[PDB]
Design a protein around this nucleic acid. Structure first.
Length: 672
RNA sequence: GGAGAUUAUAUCC
RNA sequence: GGAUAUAAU
């Protein structure tokens, strides 16, 4: 409707549409339309009964996709990291073992960029059989699992109410629209989702449901646009560090993740319907990961689960294990059946009882559209052409974390219920009432990342069984990697969102594995040398100074970068990352202030105390203390009190650390 | 040719 | 009311 109107091709089958597309095919990072990027996907889909993907009959004269290419090939941190590991490993208990374990990770360190010619093979992961619905036994279990969380949410105080359309007015809609992508409106001049003309368009796209609902509440049929309104979804490849893996010998360089950039109109509908229920779960649902962070008291849902399972010890007091589910490529494989159970449960938690009959019908039409649009997407493939995608989670939707987390939680509870009805004398209702009590404190998911206590199965009179867990997931087309799913009784192997917990004599302390740091460093492409030096310090911040080996290694790398730090001169990249420092030290961001900061940078050290202050919560019992440049350019001194356990970690040398982890059996935190 | 959502945190305005 | 940066999913 905006001059970009699509034309209809003549064919119907994918193989014939593909031939038709050649007639539109077109530096090395400008976009060129290329229908051959679809060849393998079309070939794969042709052998499937119910494929997740078809070529769209409708196409645009001009595509939205942009070109790309490979990153800078140099890896400037690999050599300094090796010297640092060479030195610090000598102060650990097994120096040659540490250096070998660490070399494995450095070798895998890599990096992905957006490039249409490397992105299209990743899309094959999204091309497989649909699972529209599951069989009777599984459905009964999944609907019982829905009652578990619905009960949990009510007990936790859920009082979320349906919004009125007053909140779809431009001035009120702003409070539930975050800044970000204009999606397909970027072609029309919009730069941000929160731009006033976009906000006006998103508002109109919500208010149009009012009169549609008036008709349905009178028993008339809905307007036609309700069932046909669609928005284009754009795609691109993720730019990030990513570790290669060794699969059957060959070291497999990483394929870029497939990212979806959804339309602001779809965003506005999702947020109008479900912003509140999402924020209620973040604040109050103990199984809901989103809201988590590693510092400042934000890991409490993780720590509460661990402390219920370990009660002060380093191994679980009973033998009850902890399970960390390892699922292959969650977003590509989340089927329509699981998406429906998840979003339906979320919509059910929203209280509609105060709505008028028109208001209720209006919300029903809005939900109808949001559900259909989560399930069936119109996606511009990196070939430069539209395809239709049924199921899969479109990573980048408003619903991504919310629905992935809800679905993973429903999987394990549905599985538990399914086993109980088959194997024991519990009914669906009876298993549900047990799990509703036991799930509070025994389960947490963050999308496909999951951690749960075997007590979920204990209270059903069952023991966890990974093959039965994998078989349940396979009913939804998902592959639980059984040999990579950690099952343990030891705190040192418990993980959540890439974080470990170390129990010190004064309490728990979030930490991170060393191998993850080494791969990221080995994968870092060459930037401006000041930018890269500040990246190494950002890594210190990410690790929060808990581990003195990690601090030592990073402090070594930081020093080593000083030899060549000034070789590029004061570039614009270096100016940008030094601006905050120049204004806090000299009052201005002018050339001389910036160069004074620049030339002093070689003289700075990042204080481990500043890093460990990040464990301090902002509690009204704790004042964490301002950091200024303490963890970036290092030109302020951090004054402030650490938490007891973090104070213990400051007083703790490489040598004391390895001894304590050895004596407590917590050395699992270092690797994996 | 000049790269999504969500969460957490830090810095500066 | 905004900007920049890193991490996680």
């Amino acid at each position: 409707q905006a001059r970009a109107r699509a034309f209809r091709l003549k064919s119907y089958a994918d193989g014939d549409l593909l031939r038709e597309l050649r007639q539109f095919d077109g530096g090395p990072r400008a976009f060129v339309r290329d229908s051959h990027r679809l060849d393998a996907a079309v070939e794969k889909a042709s052998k499937l009964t119910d494929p997740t993907f078809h070529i769209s009959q409708y196409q645009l004269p001009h595509p939205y996709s942009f070109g790309g290419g490979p990153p800078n090939p140099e890896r400037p941190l690999t050599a300094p990291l090796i010297s640092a590991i060479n030195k610090v490993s000598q102060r650990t208990r097994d120096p040659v073992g540490y250096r070998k374990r660490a070399k494995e990770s450095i070798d895998l360190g890599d990096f992905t960029t957006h490039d249409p010619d490397t992105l299209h093979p990743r899309f094959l992961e999204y091309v497989h059989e649909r699972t529209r619905s599951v069989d009777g036994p599984t459905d009964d279990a999944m609907r019982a699992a829905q009652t578990v969380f619905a009960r949990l949410w009510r007990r936790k105080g859920c009082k979320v109410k349906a919004r009125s359309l007053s909140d779809a007015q431009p001035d009120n809609l702003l409070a539930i629209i975050k800044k970000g992508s204009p999606g397909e409106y970027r072609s029309l001049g919009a730069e941000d989702r929160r731009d006033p003309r976009l906000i006006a368009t998103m508002s109109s796209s919500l208010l149009r449901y009012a009169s549609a609902g008036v008709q349905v509440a009178r028993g008339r049929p809905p307007p036609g646009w309700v069932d046909t309104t669609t928005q284009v979804t754009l795609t691109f490849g993720k730019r990030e560090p990513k570790a290669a893996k060794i699969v059957d010998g060959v070291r497999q360089a990483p394929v870029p993740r497939f990212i979806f950039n959804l339309s602001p109109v779809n965003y506005a509908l999702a947020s109008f319907l479900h912003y509140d229920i999402s924020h209620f779960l973040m604040d109050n649902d103990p199984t809901h990961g989103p809201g988590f962070g590693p510092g400042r008291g934000r890991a409490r849902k993780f720590m509460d689960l661990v402390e219920r399972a370990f009660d002060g010890r380093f191994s679980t007091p009973d033998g009850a294990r902890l399970i960390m589910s390892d699922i292959t490529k969650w977003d590509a494989n989340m089927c329509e059946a699981l998406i429906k159970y998840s979003i339906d449960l979320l919509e059910d938690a929203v209280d509609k009882s105060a709505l008028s009959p028109e208001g209720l019908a209006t919300r029903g039409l809005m939900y109808r559209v949001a559900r259909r649009q989560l399930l069936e997407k119109l996606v511009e493939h990196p070939a430069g052409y539209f395809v239709k995608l049924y199921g899969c989670m479109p990573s980048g939707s408003f619903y991504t974390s919310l629905v992935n987390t809800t679905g993973n939680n429903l999987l394990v509870i549905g599985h538990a219920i399914a086993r109980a009805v088959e194997e024991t004398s519990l009914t669906h209702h009876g298993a549900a009432e047990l799990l509703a009590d036991a799930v509070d404190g025994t389960l947490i998911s963050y999308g496909d990342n999951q951690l749960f206590s075997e007590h979920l199965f204990s209270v059903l009179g069952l023991a966890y069984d990974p093959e039965k867990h994998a078989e349940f997931l396979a009913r939804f087309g998902m592959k639980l990697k059984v040999d990579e799913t950690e099952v343990t009784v030891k705190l040192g192997r418990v993980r959540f969102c890439s974080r470990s917990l170390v129990r010190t004599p004064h309490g728990l302390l979030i930490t991170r594995s060393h191998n993850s740091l080494f791969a990221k460093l080995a994968g870092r492409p060459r930037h401006d040398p000041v930018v890269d030096k500040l990246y190494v310090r950002a890594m210190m911040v990410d690790h929060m100074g808990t581990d003195p080996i990690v601090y030592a290694i990073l402090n070594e790398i930081d020093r080593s970068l000083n030899v060549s730090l000034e070789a590029a001169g004061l570039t614009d990249a270096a100016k940008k990352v030094l601006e905050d420092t120049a204004q806090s030290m000299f009052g201005n961001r002018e050339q001389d202030a910036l160069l004074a900061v620049y030339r002093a940078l070689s003289e700075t050290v990042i204080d481990r105390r500043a890093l460990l202050s990040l464990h301090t919560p902002r509690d009204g019992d704790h004042d964490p203390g301002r950091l200024h440049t303490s963890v970036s350019t290092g030109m302020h001194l951090f004054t402030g009190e650490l938490t007891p356990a973090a104070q213990w970690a400051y007083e703790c040398t490489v040598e004391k650390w390895c001894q304590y982890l050895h004596d407590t059996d917590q050395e699992g935190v270092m690797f994996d």
